[PDB]
Symmetry: D2
Subunit: 141 residues, 4 copies
């Protein structure tokens, strides 16, 4: 579930490690998702023919992951409150495309791990991200 | 003064070269400030004993710098809107420390320049940033 | 085994992705090793009491992994030739400390993977690094 | 002219702020050159049609720049040694293109400055780099 201490862990960690280099965190969050779900690369017509090893270098990828991280920044600042409404607002748009809350849960389940592996997240922050994913995907119904 | 073209010029560039690495842009805007105005380092009590050459590496410098650009990010979002009010909302606390609109002008004026030299900004965006400085300072009084 | 095409893959990939940001590659290569072998943190007296999540931010870690990557750069430039002699020269020094070719093989077995995960290494480069580890550890006897 | 103190000043700083991120130092040394001497961009045929503001992002710019700093890294290693000879070893191929020791002096002279503004170099190292420029240019003829 998500308590105010959890919201603090996630937010303190976001100012310290993530907010200052949003592009770096966005590229590794999605790179981890696409090596785990390679076929989902096909939803991104602007770069679905780039091989996996060329994505971090591809500007169409970089603009896309920065568009996502820029919206997640707004969700993290809103975790005490309308974060659930901000996840909600993107379901129509993605639904058009064939992308459900199952795909979103898959992306949100990986960021605790990517933040531990590369962005110096402590165990409390990683566990709080585990909880936040469950919370934020539930907000979409 | 600002036209919709100038606000698109600033916003597109900010998304392109600044948003993905807010810490670098922040470190260099304050480094060009603190180089040009070396005595005002005394105002920054949690790093006023670091010599200039040691600041980009100093953890408290980087916290300060990112707290400024994190706010500035939000006034860029709001340039055809309440950007003015967000700048003026910071004047009474800084006034209490001896830091006037003179000071803010000094900072705001260096930004175009810093973006041209290190963050890939064209002469149109450099121009828009020179005028954005004047608007924001004019809304502060 | 290691052929000249393999040496080309590793070297082309090192100029493209690694040489320009040696510090970033050095911190993730060892971070991956120390999350896999946490107890080996005890060999590094200058930072053995730092928790895992604080290493990427710790200057004593950064200086150490940059000392290692700076020597590996010299080994990669030497892969057609005296690379084996350059690995050889560090066995005495590490032997003093209790660190064998078993520990070195453990570090070299992970860099193909870290380069795929974070430094855009193609499958041919990753497989060539798999071979290079076997080769370079063998050079130490 | 160079004393052992000046060579330690340069080398320690290079290991500290330059070696871990050779690409940034390279991009900015050539960006300060190409800003001060904008016509010599015509010499760089694989990126001579990119306007100045687009160069830090240009892949061929970054390849060129890193090929220079990759070599320069090696002449720093050899400053109490064959640094001179390594600089002069590049004169006949560049002479063939119309690029003289005038040109190299222009580059070498900007380095201290660039390191002071963006790479945390103290006034002693800035001084050592001003003299290293003169020595290296004097060994070239
Ligand atoms: C995990 C949180 C995610 C958020 C907040 C998010 C947000 C966004 C945003 C802000 C856009 C731009 C369009 C708009 O403003 O509505 C976008 C587009 C898109 N995203 Fe999502 N995204 C998420 C998950 C996903 C997932 C999991 C996929 C695919 C597996 C996906 C696929 C796409 C695609 C294909 C586009 C359209 C890109 C284009 O061609 O322009 N996103 N995303
Ligand atoms: C557009 C420019 C600036 C903005 C948006 C800005 C914003 C901020 C913010 C967000 C804080 C934290 C507390 C608060 O919410 O007020 C702060 C604190 C402070 N700022 Fe400003 N600032 C600006 C300019 C300056 C300048 C030019 C100086 C000094 C000449 C300055 C001096 C200080 C001081 C001394 C503190 C440090 C408080 C502490 O010791 O932690 N700032 N700034
Ligand atoms: C994989 C290739 C490795 C290379 C080329 C390498 C190279 C180096 C270098 C150049 C030094 C500095 C001392 C000197 O010049 O001899 C060093 C020190 C050290 N390395 Fe290695 N290293 C490697 C593997 C390891 C491994 C696997 C460990 C530990 C599990 C290790 C432990 C140490 C320690 C503890 C020091 C001393 C640090 C100090 O307190 O100053 N290294 N390494
Ligand atoms: C200390 C300064 C410099 C060094 C060490 C250096 C080194 C190099 C190196 C390593 C190359 C690749 C080929 C070779 O091995 O010779 C090269 C090529 C080239 N350099 Fe220099 N360079 C320096 C200064 C300059 C300057 C100041 C200019 C022009 C005003 C310049 C113009 C060129 C040109 C045009 C090429 C491009 C070849 C191609 O089109 O790929 N360089 N440089
Ligand atoms: C979503 N991208
Ligand atoms: C304002 N700092
Ligand atoms: C070896 N460090
Ligand atoms: C020389 N480029």
């Amino acid at each position: 579930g998500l308590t105010a201490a959890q919201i603090k862990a996630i937010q303190d960690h976001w100012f310290l490690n993530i907010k200052g280099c949003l592009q770096a965190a966005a590229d590794s969050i999605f790179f981890k998702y696409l090596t785990a779900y390679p076929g989902d690369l096909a939803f991104f017509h602007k770069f679905s023919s780039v091989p996996l090893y060329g994505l971090r270098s591809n500007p169409a990828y970089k603009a896309q992951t920065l568009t996502v991280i820029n919206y997640l920044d707004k969700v993290v600042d809103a975790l005490g409150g309308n974060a659930g409404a901000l996840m909600k607002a993107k379901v129509p748009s993605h639904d058009a495309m064939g992308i459900t809350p199952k795909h979103f849960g898959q992306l949100l389940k990986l960021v605790g791990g990517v933040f531990q592996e590369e962005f110096s997240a402590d165990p409390t922050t990683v566990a709080a991200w585990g909880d936040a994913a469950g919370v934020l995907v539930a907000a979409m119904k």
